[PDB]
Amino acid sequence: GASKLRAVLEKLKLSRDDISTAAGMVKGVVDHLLLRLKCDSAFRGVGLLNEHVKISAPNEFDVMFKLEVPRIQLEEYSNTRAYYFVKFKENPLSQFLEGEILSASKMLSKFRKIIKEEINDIKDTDVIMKRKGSPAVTLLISEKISVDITLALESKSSWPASTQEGLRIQNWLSAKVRKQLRLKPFYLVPKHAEETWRLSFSHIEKEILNNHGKSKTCCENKEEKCCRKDCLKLMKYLLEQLKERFKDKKHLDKFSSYHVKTAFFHVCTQNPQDSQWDRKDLGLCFDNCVTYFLQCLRTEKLENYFIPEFNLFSSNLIDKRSKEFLTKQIEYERNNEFPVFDE
Numbered sequence: 001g002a003s004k005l006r007a008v009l010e011k012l013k014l015s016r017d018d019i020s021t022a023a024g025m026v027k028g029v030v031d032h033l034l035l036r037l038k039c040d041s042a043f044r045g046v047g048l049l050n051e052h053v054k055i056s057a058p059n060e061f062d063v064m065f066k067l068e069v070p071r072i073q074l075e076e077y078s079n080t081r082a083y084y085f086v087k088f089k090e091n092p093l094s095q096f097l098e099g100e101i102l103s104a105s106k107m108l109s110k111f112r113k114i115i116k117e118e119i120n121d122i123k124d125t126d127v128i129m130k131r132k133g134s135p136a137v138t139l140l141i142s143e144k145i146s147v148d149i150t151l152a153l154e155s156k157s158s159w160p161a162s163t164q165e166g167l168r169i170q171n172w173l174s175a176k177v178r179k180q181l182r183l184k185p186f187y188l189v190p191k192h193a194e195e196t197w198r199l200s201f202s203h204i205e206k207e208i209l210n211n212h213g214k215s216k217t218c219c220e221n222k223e224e225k226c227c228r229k230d231c232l233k234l235m236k237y238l239l240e241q242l243k244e245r246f247k248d249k250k251h252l253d254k255f256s257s258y259h260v261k262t263a264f265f266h267v268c269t270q271n272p273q274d275s276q277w278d279r280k281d282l283g284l285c286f287d288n289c290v291t292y293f294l295q296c297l298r299t300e301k302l303e304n305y306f307i308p309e310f311n312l313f314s315s316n317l318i319d320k321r322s323k324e325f326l327t328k329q330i331e332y333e334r335n336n337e338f339p340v341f342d343e
């Protein structure tokens with residue numbers, strides 16, 4: 001229970017601090033790519049959004065480039081609630097226009113082109129490009145260190161209608177904090193469902209996790225140490241280890257860490273009191289996460305945290321057979337003190 005889990009977490013800490021010069025190298029490579037991209041006309045206002053994608057793989061990094069687009073006209077695609085076309089009312093991005101719709105594909109292509117020419121331009125460190133919508137471009141710094149650069153439109157207008165009932169943090173973080181978060185911009189990233197774009201709130205997880213308690217002083221002193229971050233880390237690591245166990249099969253290909261995050265923040269809404277995440281109760285709180293996740297698999301309901309009407313576990317998205325397979329795997333694990341945490 002709690003002791004075994006804390007040992008898993010200390011192991012993860014020793015793994016992650018594998019000389020964190022990888023962070024400095026990716027910082028440099030990204031600062032160079034941005035330095036070149038801001039020269040081109042189609043990419044004048046590009047920037048960093050603010051970052052690890054895997055806990056078991058401290059060499060796999062993830063970075064997002066924002067590109068502000070004012071006076072943007074969003075058109076929902078076929079009742080999806082999640083995908084949109086980008087339109088306009090001269091234009092800097094006139095190069096990517098196809099009719100009135102803004103082509104993700106043309107945009108991504110000029111992006112990749114600029115980045116390929118500039119990685120060849122750097123004759124100091126070894127950087128290789130691989131092409132496979134999101135992630136947009138994946139790069140390899142010198143060996144084993146991989147960086148996934150994504151491109152996003154940024155809109156500083158109010159969030160689209162589909163998110164109205166979403167971000168249900170009022171009982172936990174507060175109504176005040178929900179309102180101030182919704183005043184932050186929102187993002188769009190290429191993703192096929194068609195030149196459809198998809199809503200993106202990757203900047204909100206950081207905001208919530210850095211200020212995560214109902215008490216403003218949570219995790220700021222000895223008496224108020226909670227285990228929320230640790231439970232999220234263990235849920236990410238649980239899914240990652242199961243996916244590694246079946247990497248040669250497709251059984252789990254359709255589950256991702258964002259299913260884990262969605263379920264975790266639902267449990268945070270369910271369990272708003274800091275008293276329900278006491279550090280001492282790690283084993284219990286984690287069990288709370290697992291059970292909830294299991295319940296979502298069995299009921300085939302996992303609402304997206306921002307667009308509640310979009311079901312991430314809909315039968316039209318993930319197979320019932322995959323959902324039962326992961327159900328059985330997770331249940332075995334919880335019944336056996338999670339041996340998968342051991343490689």
Ligand SMILES: Cn1ccc(-c2ccc(Cl)c(CNc3nc4[nH]c(Cc5ccccc5)cc(=O)n4n3)c2)n1
Pocket residue numbers: 081082198199200201202203204205258261262265304305306307310
């Ligand atoms: C990566 N993928 C692949 C498909 C989608 C996707 C599918 C449907 C919708 Cl409706 C959306 C809407 N957009 C969206 N949903 C999330 N969920 C979190 C996870 C999270 C939850 C709660 C608090 C913080 C973070 C991260 C994130 O960045 N987003 N972005 C995104 N996403």
Ligand SMILES: [Zn+2]
Pocket residue numbers: 212213218219224225226227228
């Ligand atoms: Zn805390």
